[PDB]
Design an enzyme around this catalytic site. Structure first.
Site, PDB file in Angstrom:
ATOM      1  CG  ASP B 304      30.036  -6.738  28.343  1.00  0.00           C
ATOM      2  OD1 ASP B 304      30.647  -7.507  27.568  1.00  0.00           O
ATOM      3  OD2 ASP B 304      29.413  -5.721  27.974  1.00  0.00           O
ATOM      4  CG  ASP B 358      28.177  -4.404  21.073  1.00  0.00           C
ATOM      5  OD1 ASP B 358      28.550  -5.514  21.526  1.00  0.00           O
ATOM      6  OD2 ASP B 358      28.161  -3.342  21.739  1.00  0.00           O
TER       7      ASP B 358
HETATM    8  O1  9PG Z   1      35.297  -2.058  21.510  1.00  0.00           O
HETATM    9  N1  9PG Z   1      34.280  -2.508  21.006  1.00  0.00           N
HETATM   10  O2  9PG Z   1      34.323  -3.070  19.635  1.00  0.00           O
HETATM   11  C1  9PG Z   1      33.087  -2.586  21.807  1.00  0.00           C
HETATM   12  C2  9PG Z   1      32.797  -1.693  22.898  1.00  0.00           C
HETATM   13  C3  9PG Z   1      31.649  -1.874  23.639  1.00  0.00           C
HETATM   14  C4  9PG Z   1      30.767  -2.960  23.320  1.00  0.00           C
HETATM   15  O3  9PG Z   1      29.543  -3.248  24.037  1.00  0.00           O
HETATM   16  C5  9PG Z   1      29.640  -4.192  25.024  1.00  0.00           C
HETATM   17  O4  9PG Z   1      29.459  -3.496  26.328  1.00  0.00           O
HETATM   18  C6  9PG Z   1      28.196  -2.632  26.311  1.00  0.00           C
HETATM   19  C7  9PG Z   1      28.088  -1.898  27.620  1.00  0.00           C
HETATM   20  O5  9PG Z   1      29.135  -0.856  27.663  1.00  0.00           O
HETATM   21  C8  9PG Z   1      26.931  -3.440  26.034  1.00  0.00           C
HETATM   22  O6  9PG Z   1      26.479  -4.244  27.139  1.00  0.00           O
HETATM   23  C9  9PG Z   1      27.175  -4.326  24.841  1.00  0.00           C
HETATM   24  O7  9PG Z   1      26.008  -5.148  24.723  1.00  0.00           O
HETATM   25  C10 9PG Z   1      28.472  -5.140  24.999  1.00  0.00           C
HETATM   26  O8  9PG Z   1      28.638  -6.101  24.006  1.00  0.00           O
HETATM   27  C11 9PG Z   1      31.085  -3.810  22.236  1.00  0.00           C
HETATM   28  C12 9PG Z   1      32.230  -3.633  21.492  1.00  0.00           C
END
Ligand code: 9PG
Ligand code: 9PG
Ligand code: 9PG
Ligand code: 9PG
Lengths: 479, 479, 479, 479
Positions: B304, B358
């Site tokens: 990730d 997400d």
């Molecule tokens: O800043 N944003 O827009 C944002 C923050 C976190 C996020 O989640 C990701 O990390 C997560 C784990 O912390 C999960 O594994 C998730 O499935 C991933 O896609 C997605 C977007």
């Protein structure tokens, strides 16, 4: 360039450099830019200013630097780059301070470098072509002495004892007045009687003015008729718009990429400009000033405002070195005292080097040091602060802490304050004063003669504590 | 370079490029920069975001792009360049849409390219040194399909069926809790039990924390003892200021040209930083994490925040692709799911690729989508929108639309909304959920197993119309 | 109001005012605002500062006024209004100067008035409700002399001869030290031994500190046992944030319309605040300080920083004059020296009035005078300049030009400079020094006693030419 | 006005007021502006927001308030003045907190006041004409209960038990859907079946829309055919540009001094405007809405967005009171629930009063609470924070904490989170939910019926600790 791992001072250190060799006290790095990461949380950064009057002190890398005012005066305070920056840059050498009192030092071995200091990084960057670096980790005094060994030296015996006209009469000197003072001065154990600013017609017109009607070669003969070497002051590469030279030779002025004169500061109530030390004609007219003074009888020369020959900073050090190299040979084995001079690029050429701001008959002008954020102004505290952080250069040149006061007439300094400066003159061996003897009380005349005539042993105990004879002198409250 | 004329798709297209040859479905151009002129009034621009969570949609090139807020989150939303610019730039590929529903598509065939869109021009610029392009004019689906076949593939049979810990327990996971859930989940037709964010001590400290006392190898063996493969989540190149490794190896932090750490965004309430993926010592340490995870018994890895290895944007894709190449192989034949990743520069390296933001237990957070103008935030609407515009990658990688919800407990989605996301999982064939079965109603337990355990046939009839089984799912309302 | 025509000084002057009648030496006008038109091209404006330390000089009305810096010090330099405005405003009185060395003078006869100057107009505005004015055209000296006779008087014989502790020891005074100095000083023809700033615990805590263990009544009795009167210094309405009274009586602090404390400037390294002088409980507490000092045995009081009782400027003069009226009388017939005080609103209340900035052991601090554009800082040049332009008050109050220096130890003034200040002391007849006699040379001990103990006759021949004894002192160079 | 000294709570307190009388629990002050100085260093300020959704909390007076975003939404967050200010202002009442847990309280007894809080001052300022104040020093709960006694009361027995349509279906309601829900709801111990937002054609067009074809009087009859009172929702003084009323009666819109409509917020995706509650025609059209609903069969009315009748803040409270006074009489002894209402100016007229933001099916939308600095958005934490700080109004009105959740379907809240809200409904006696019974699990149906049918004793132990039955509930972590 390449990532490298190293064991230095019993610590693991990580760095980025194009090449690495062994070296006495640490290592030798190569690269136009090198990055050195401390193996500790860094509490202090050694910010080394560019020239004599520039701030040399340990600073909090976390808090931001304060703009120095007024803008007109920055060219005569430091490297213009170190002051315009929002980060902590220094000239030539930097150092980070571990919690245990040891220092990681990164220092250039060639001209025209700067060092950046953050709490997690020491970054060296050569302005022009790349060059060599020295890296060391250890006790604070060892790593600086190890760095000094690897730079040019020029140690001409012991530094002379000078009487200097500046810090009493300033520009209001005159052949009649200095003849009288010469009479009282010759009764003391001085070696040189140095005329400072005030004898010339103008900057760039280095000929005696109305108040020296019998010329300079006359004065120097009377000075040696009393068993004393004669010393004279020049700002060779400095000029104002009002100077005859500035209009008679406009092609000699140092200009930027648009042909505007480069600003060199503000002093004597006037904007200052620089003669181009890259111009071979100019370097010759300047070397001719040295030999015109030697022909006059002077064998001690105070070459001032020397940063003008190296503007606009690190980028100009190579021109500066070439030009002072020529004046150095023109001077033969006359004594050359560099003032307002790029500190590290002067090593090897200068005989004595001013390492701090002007002393003054007062501790601190808080209006200039605090409200204008300018620690390069005249003042005994400003003088002491930078000089203490440049004593490691005693290996490489006579270190001039500037004159010592003994008078209390026409002086605001306290006796305790005056002894702090006296003690650094003992420590460096560089002994000068501007006190006219008729301004000294009898008690004070005797202190002056004992100061010149005895070599007082002095010892360094720590960064700010000295043992002068048997007194212990502590400077740490100052900062 | 040279001006060229061309018959593309039965229309006459003017273009500027250094070279041109024939290509299945259009032409290949060469050049660091190339320019293509539409033979129509272009009514839409296909703005392709950089990474998994970036926006991928058709936009009105006439109206200006809205700044994304807050500024601190820009590095985790997209290529920083695409968000600073005042024009419409895309990553890798852009397209212009004619009045007849046909597309003029320009797409890079190498790393590090952006595409600019006006209604009168498609401009393609490589950040680094030049490369090849694919130009094509035809029906929307075929030109994107044609573009796909010239990019790398890694299609590894069928994608596994995953139970994922994130979209139910988020970071509040632990050994005992996941043992209880493993028992419930092992009664459904899953193939991978994957532990998401929450097991680690800190970013860059990828060892089990106080809530996984028996460690991660234990947990993998428990998972395999139920006939499941064991999955594990890493953010290998991400690091925070309070992470131990940020202090112990400051030389691994990705720094700008003045030694400041480059910012990677803001999550878990803290500013984010990156480990330097051009630092070979970092890449092998990251490769070691993959080996340690395999040794622990995990053969499914969700990697990730992978954008952190490609900062600051198209200019980082070269360093990124090599670092991912070393990971792709310490993994052997393990399954690598790429998340938060540069989309096109991952192809041929990932087995699975997240292609949208997400999902979340709610349709849209209007405060982040509208008022902060951030379509990369979690939300089912945000997720579907970028996923629908990247389905064309299904012949290059397993396209992950993110998990599917079946619970109504602890979930704000309507049933109609949930079946949109289910449909896209059938279509891509990437089937995953996070629902703890104990949270499920008997109805929902049935639909979950119906969903996992037979392959529903599924057809695309429009860009946003789908026939899954027989349901004609239409996604046109949402955009 | 009404338009008027007038023969003033044999020229025809147009003016606007509500009323007009005859007056010794010119006319009296009435009106909240009045306007006066010069019958000449006005080549100078007399800009009269608000308080003792404010600038009082002739200025070029054509060229704009320079902002005074730093902003924090503006409340202790002048009426805040006079420093914010972009025009030339004065306090109480202004004058325009014709080409024949004659002045057109407009001066308020009541509290709270400013005067604006252009080369084409004199405008007078009362901040509060309206009042009377004095208008006059004639030779410079007579119009100011004439203006003086319509303002209050309190001329209490001859001014005492004072030894003042400030301009030698500053705040580093103590009981034992001042006992030693009292012994030395009591051998000269002084009448008052005055302890300046340094005895108190804090501003608003006007009780002796650790360095005056036996207290202040003890010290007054020791002073009287040598045939001297005992003087004491207060800053009654000044207070700092760390002062106990600032915490224990926050309701006594002078606050703006939103309850913030109004700033009184910056001294002793701290921000300054004011006690509210319209708070009758404050005025009586301040009146009690006068009574306590009399009870202690002091019958000479230097009341300092008195502008703090008149903030925010002309609008405060009403509250000020009443508060000073209550002090003037708790003092009975003690001698009140007003320092840092609104000049004209003090008349008839003070026995003595400082009329210029502090003297200092130096001519000028160019950093504060020039670069911070602050002529109210300490300095002999600053002191003479405002003093020379307020000598016309000598028939209303004892005009204090500040102390006279005779020492050359711990003093940077030249002998020529020192005798300027001596001359003005002879002229006003207010004789004071701070020189500890032990600091004096035998020569200087003699001139000090010569100075104190016979009345030298002294004549004004120009605005800046004086005959003291026979010396024709000319102050024209300094301005 | 006058300076006054007072003994309050065994402390000496200083104040500035025009008059002072005795009063139960403290004193009564008079004055358009009063100033009260704490006899301690103040650690906290009680910042009381204006209306239901407004922040009510103890804050650090030292640090500055954070601008609430976006500007479009401030009119529906607080008094526009309290948000534009750079200082800490509150509506009606303020309080400073001593180090010992006691509070100095200053509270208005008339309409249209604000209180300023600094660490050294409490300043009360009536926007319009002067008025009475209550001042008290003592334990925190006593001084607030003492203040509440002196305000209007209206306690109509015990608050009803309501089923409310909003917090499940929101605007997507409809006569058919609510008929089914009414059937399941009538099996529980509710007293009122309240239709919320979603039945009207538009703001200002308060007639049933397409989804209520048999009108509102029909629905209310079926509701009472099941033994339940029927409740209906209005925003009487609110309008959008799209409303028929906004164009048919442009003279009814509330306009500023230039005739522009006053901005009232942003909701339902549209800019909001206000009908002029000063216009007697408008107040009648509004009272006619009350009686049209009573004629329809509804005896419970939820009057929402009531701040629109009092814009632009304190200055509009007198119009607001007059206008709600008329609606109050029009309603007879129907139940009136004030929502979005100026909190203190509603006392005496409202039967129940919303005292905090909307609960929501989630704890906190960090995007709105943190990134937009808006604590008035929907959310259980935002709801609880303000309600806890307004419970002292239970003396004066039924305090509505907003609905209680029991479902876990279509809800993100945790069971622990839900019990915090349930416990405040017990404490106030105000019991409502929006949970459709078919969304409740059997376990959850039983909790709901036990919640409605039993009166659980509840006790306050401290500001954030309660004893509900025998459980101890602590809210202090929340803040
Ligand atoms: O800043 N944003 O827009 C944002 C923050 C976190 C996020 O989640 C990701 O990390 C997560 C784990 O912390 C999960 O594994 C998730 O499935 C991933 O896609 C997605 C977007
Ligand atoms: O703050 N400045 O910009 C500034 C500093 C020092 C200074 O003095 C130098 O020039 C003097 C002669 O003019 C003396 O020779 C003195 O010894 C020199 O160091 C002048 C100006
Ligand atoms: O801000 N200034 O420009 C400024 C500060 C102090 C000052 O001195 C006054 O207070 C002193 C005591 O602190 C002496 O009594 C002195 O005699 C007073 O005039 C004068 C000017
Ligand atoms: O953050 N805002 O601006 C905002 C807060 C609350 C709100 O809801 C109110 O209106 C609702 C109906 O529309 C419900 O009746 C609810 O119970 C009311 O409290 C709407 C907007």
């Amino acid at each position: 360039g390449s990532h490298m791992r190293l064991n230095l001072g019993g610590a693991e250190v990580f760095l980025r450099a194009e090449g690495l060799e062994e070296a006495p006290g640490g290592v030798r790095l190569w690269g136009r830019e090198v990055r050195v990461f401390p193996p500790f949380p860094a509490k202090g950064f050694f910010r080394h200013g560019w020239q004599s009057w520039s701030l040399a002190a340990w600073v909090d890398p976390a808090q931001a630097p304060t703009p120095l005012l007024p803008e007109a005066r920055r060219p005569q305070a430091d490297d213009p780059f170190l002051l315009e920056a929002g980060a902590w840059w220094g000239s030539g050498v930097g150092a980070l301070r571990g919690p245990d009192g040891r220092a990681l030092l990164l220092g250039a071995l060639d001209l025209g470098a700067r060092v950046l200091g953050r709490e997690d990084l020491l970054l060296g960057r050569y302005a022009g072509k790349g060059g060599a670096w020295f890296l060391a980790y250890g006790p604070e005094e060892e790593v600086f002495a190890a760095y000094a060994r690897l730079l040019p030296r020029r140690l001409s015996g012991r530094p002379p004892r000078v009487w200097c006209s500046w810090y009493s009469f300033y520009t209001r000197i005159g052949e009649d007045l200095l003849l009288r003072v010469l009479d009282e001065v010759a009764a003391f154990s001085f070696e040189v009687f140095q005329i400072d600013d005030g004898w010339q017609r103008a900057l760039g017109d280095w000929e005696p003015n109305d108040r020296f009607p019998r010329g300079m070669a006359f004065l120097a003969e009377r000075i040696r008729e009393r068993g004393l070497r004669a010393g004279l002051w020049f700002a060779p590469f400095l000029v104002t718009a009002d100077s005859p030279l500035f209009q008679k030779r406009p092609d000699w002025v140092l200009r930027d990429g648009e042909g505007r004169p480069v600003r060199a500061g503000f002093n004597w109530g006037r904007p200052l400009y620089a003669l181009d030390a890259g111009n071979e004609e100019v370097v010759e007219w300047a070397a001719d000033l040295v030999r015109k003074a030697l022909a006059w009888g002077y064998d001690y020369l105070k070459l001032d405002f020397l940063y003008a020959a190296a503007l606009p900073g690190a980028e100009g050090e190579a021109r500066y070195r070439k030009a002072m190299a020529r004046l150095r040979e023109a001077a033969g084995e006359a004594y050359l005292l560099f003032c307002g001079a790029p500190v590290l690029a002067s090593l090897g050429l200068a005989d004595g080097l001013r390492v701090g701001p002007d002393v003054a008959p007062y501790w601190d002008n808080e209006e200039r040091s605090f409200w204008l954020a300018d620690p390069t102004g005249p003042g005994l505290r400003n003088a002491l602060r930078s000089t203490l952080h440049r004593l490691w250069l005693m290996e490489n040149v006579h270190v001039d802490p500037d004159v010592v006061y003994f008078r209390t007439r026409f002086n605001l300094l306290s006796p305790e304050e005056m002894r702090l400066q006296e003690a650094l003159a003992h420590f460096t061996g560089f002994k000068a004063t501007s006190d006219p003897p008729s301004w000294l009380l009898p008690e004070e005349k005797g202190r002056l003669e004992a100061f010149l005539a005895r070599e007082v042993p002095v010892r360094r105990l720590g960064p700010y504590r000295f043992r002068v004879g048997e007194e212990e002198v502590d400077y740490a409250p100052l900062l």
